[PDB]
């Protein structure tokens, strides 16, 4: 999960087309590889507003806390018995 720690700013992907000579991916987008790293959401929003970029923000999706019990694998009367191990 170490790649889910920081905020990122990317841009909308523009056209990539086939190079007629070699088949390479040609682009005319200068911002196609620009990925910026931010510690918080507000730093990224301030940097986008400072540069006149129209932005959209997705909230951080954290995994919710799970209830883990190894003994639940071997319950007396619940469906959470494992059939194998």
């Amino acid at each position: 999960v170490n790649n889910t720690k920081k905020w990122k700013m990317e841009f909308d992907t523009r056209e990539r087309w086939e190079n007629p000579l070699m088949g390479w991916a040609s682009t005319a987008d200068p911002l196609s590889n620009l990925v910026l790293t931010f510690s918080t959401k507000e730093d990224a929003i301030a940097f986008a507003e400072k540069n006149g970029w129209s932005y959209d923000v997705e909230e951080r999706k954290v995994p919710k806390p799970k209830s883990k019990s190894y003994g639940a694998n071997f319950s007396w009367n619940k469906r959470t018995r494992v059939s194998t191990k």
């Binding site: 009367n77 619940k78 959470t80 059939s83």
Partner: protein, 44 residues
């Protein structure tokens, strides 16, 4: 008379392949009713 010279466990010379399971079938009538988990299996 006290005997300490013969091996008294000579019954297992006459055990067949279904001796254990026929003994379990004989013992099935002596036993208490089993407890229930309330469902037919953990996949029910």
């Amino acid at each position: 008379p006290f005997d300490n010279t013969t091996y008294k466990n000579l019954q297992h010379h006459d055990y067949s392949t279904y001796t254990f399971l026929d003994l379990n079938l004989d013992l099935s009538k002596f036993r208490m009713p089993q407890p229930s988990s309330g469902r037919e299996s953990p996949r029910h």
